[PDB]
Nucleic acid binder design. Sequence first.
RNA 1: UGUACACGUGGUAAACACGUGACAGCAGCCCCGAUGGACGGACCGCGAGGACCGUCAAGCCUAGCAGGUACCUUCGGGUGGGGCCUUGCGAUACCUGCGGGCGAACCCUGUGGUCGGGUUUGCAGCCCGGCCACAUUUUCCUGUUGCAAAAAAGUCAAAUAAAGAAAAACUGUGCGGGGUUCCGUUGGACCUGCCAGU
Length: 793
Amino acid sequence: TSRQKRRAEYARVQELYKKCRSRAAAEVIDGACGGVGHSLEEMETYWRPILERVSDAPGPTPEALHALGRTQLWKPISVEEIKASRFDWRTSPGPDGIRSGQWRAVPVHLKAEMFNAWMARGEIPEILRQCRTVFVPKVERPGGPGEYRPISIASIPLRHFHSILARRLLACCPPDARQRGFICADGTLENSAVLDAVLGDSRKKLRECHVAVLDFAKAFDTVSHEALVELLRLRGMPEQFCGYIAHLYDTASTTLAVNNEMSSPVKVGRGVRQGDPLSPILFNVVMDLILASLPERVGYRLEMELVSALAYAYDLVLLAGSKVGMQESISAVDCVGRQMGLRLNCRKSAVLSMIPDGHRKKHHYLTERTFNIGGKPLRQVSCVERWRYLGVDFEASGCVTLEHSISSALNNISRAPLKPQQRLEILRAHLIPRFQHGFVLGNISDDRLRMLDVQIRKAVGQWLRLPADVPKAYYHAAVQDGGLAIPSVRATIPDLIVRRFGGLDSSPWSVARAAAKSDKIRKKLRWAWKQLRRFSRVDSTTQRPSVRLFWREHLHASVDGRELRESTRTPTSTKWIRERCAQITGRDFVQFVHTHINALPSRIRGSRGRRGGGESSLTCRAGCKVRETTAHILQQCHRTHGGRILRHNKIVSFVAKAMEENKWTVELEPRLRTSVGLRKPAIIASRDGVGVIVDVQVVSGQRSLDELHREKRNKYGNHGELVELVAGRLGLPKAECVRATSCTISWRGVWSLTSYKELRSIIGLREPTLQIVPILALRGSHMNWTRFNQMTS
RNA sequence: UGUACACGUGGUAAACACGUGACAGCAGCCCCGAUGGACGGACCGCGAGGACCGUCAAGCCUAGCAGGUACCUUCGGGUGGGGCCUUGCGAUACCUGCGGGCGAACCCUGUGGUCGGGUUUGCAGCCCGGCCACAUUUUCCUGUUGCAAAAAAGUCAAAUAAAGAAAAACUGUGCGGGGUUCCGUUGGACCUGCCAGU
Ligand SMILES: [Zn+2]
């Protein structure tokens, strides 16, 4: 039943989110939320035949070997290198069964000797060799088995054993400097700047330019086993290493796990499997070969520097100044791919041509299709809007911009079965830092960034049901200052440009340094600096611009968020927005956010600009005949009095729990009849001759919290008779040992600095206890609001 | 291009001349993203803004994106509204396509002519949309599927099935009971009755 699959999908996504956040977020963003809908039938019959298809690649030719031509490996594995390899352990279990524990428990020497024996024999056990493959729909509405994706997961020991081999390959034989894809530094670091400099130069000096982008799709599904084995054999690497790779690939199998249904193993006829740590290094050797097969004298002369190819993660951006120049380059790429089995998406590859014309001083754009990939024509795109050289969030071949693909991601996140805080976190730390690279490879304006920010804010407002008139700084202000900390692409793009392009001239690359001394790059740097200065405030400590201070300055100066200005001094106050979100339910988070920025609809806040009516729209609905502000509702209203005592006692119970856990003799509601009047302390506790009178207060924040704390600190500790009475009751002789103490929390859930410091210092409570008091304050306040709004008489 | 300043040349000095110059600076800050129009009237404090009533055929808005046309320039480039000032060298007219929201059609389904699309392969399939033609009405109660948060409340005819028929209060480290908030033996929420009181 559909409800059953929805149940299973929700459980699976929640478990994945609890275990590993990054993989779950990356799966949710792409669209892996609907699961499989075609079952085993008409699914194995489509994907099984496409797997055991050995490519008839002839292999590299003497010409390719000579173009390539233009020892410490297999060393015994020691125990230091095992921990020298950086491994991400928050991954999925293999089909064998060992998830992380049976592999973590074994000592290092045993694993080292096991790998040594494995390479001595050269045979990975079939049980450990076995791997599974789950299916992922591409478009949000699957229509056929060809619209899915076979993500394959291998065993943990095999991934660990290959990671050290990949590290050895990277250290022993580093790639060419042109290869800036799978590199130690950031891949698309200088490649974005080089293309921009080339485009600026070709427009400036009216130089003939043609830049083509062609991607390596099915590059996982097109490398022939024999071709790669021969390539590694002729590279000079040990022949037995190649034999081991050939034995690994020739003896391979795959299990189809669709709807938890077992399936027989299936042969694979094409090499390079997805997710293996050796795959992006082995494919780097193919990149080295294809780059070495490029024609020698061809490219674009950018300031005495010749630029021809800038390899991206899985792309190949070729450049040429002459129309005939790139045709032979493309033919060479085609023959290299065909001789190795690689296939190219003519649909997803594009060519940008730029032909100048004299006697007019303008520059002309070609429109018709001229170049081709072995006969198949290449589409010609006018504007450079295919800045999708960012890896994930795959391309659309110039059909759409970067938007209309961000909105798809937002819809995929919105429809996924996640709590309102989980979507917020996924957008915070997995979507914004993912497409932000794409908005720098070309000319950009402020309006595009502002519209992207507005769309993101609209999506977040829909997720958390906030009204329209909420301070826009609330979304982008940092957590410690009070806010959702949604990073804003309006100010983080100039920040990225300034931070990266500023250090362009310090890059080891010779091409990047040439690109640094350009005209367009410097103009963009000036624009980015201007925007950053306009959207930041200089830091007092370090004299360096920061956007967080600017967002805080706007937020604390607003009307809704003025009461939050005291939250930046005690980071515990806003510990529930981001860190402690797994302990708070779904609707609870939305209610807490609503009362946190005072988005609750009152007769004052909910009628902004629409107060042309009578006093009934402004007078308190309880008959208090005063202004109906949310502070009045939540703090001073006779209908809300019972809820106020309820919340107060809810807090005093939890703090009493804490001090009891800290081994203090507590006394609830002491009864002291002073001669002056009636004094009602909250709770007293004494230990080893010293006592304290701890009273609990939840008060508004429109005044300073510390002063309000002092107003009862002095009253309870300087009465002159009450301290003697509590000293006599507790059993301590000297009245100066006992002194008053308060726990003052603003009803939005903001600690008081003096109160928090006193409570931490006078009596020992660990951080988790103080973390939960804002939760109690917010819950009590919103329950008070619901109690008030439940009836209207 | 237009202001102001650094050096050099020449000169007895200049309120004299020229050239070269920090990416030379000097071309201020702040706020604003709502949405259908033409013609005729009733509303409003007839005031900035917000209601409604009549037709029209489809388009109407956009400081959103991309490309070209002309013009101003100065080479860098340039086209929304409002405010505070302050001196504090800038720049407009439209059409084309895409996205957004307001319209408007469209509408129970199967074949074919279709056309734009995606996806494996070499025009063989699956799926997304747009034109051209085909196939009694009202009326209550059991099963199948689309989203709400949980083993159930919403969906009484969303589509349905010789479908089976008819007409034409609360105050609480209180107490008891259950696959239900989401937590890895606890915690807030509602469901009930007693416990000392109002
Ligand atoms: Zn009141």
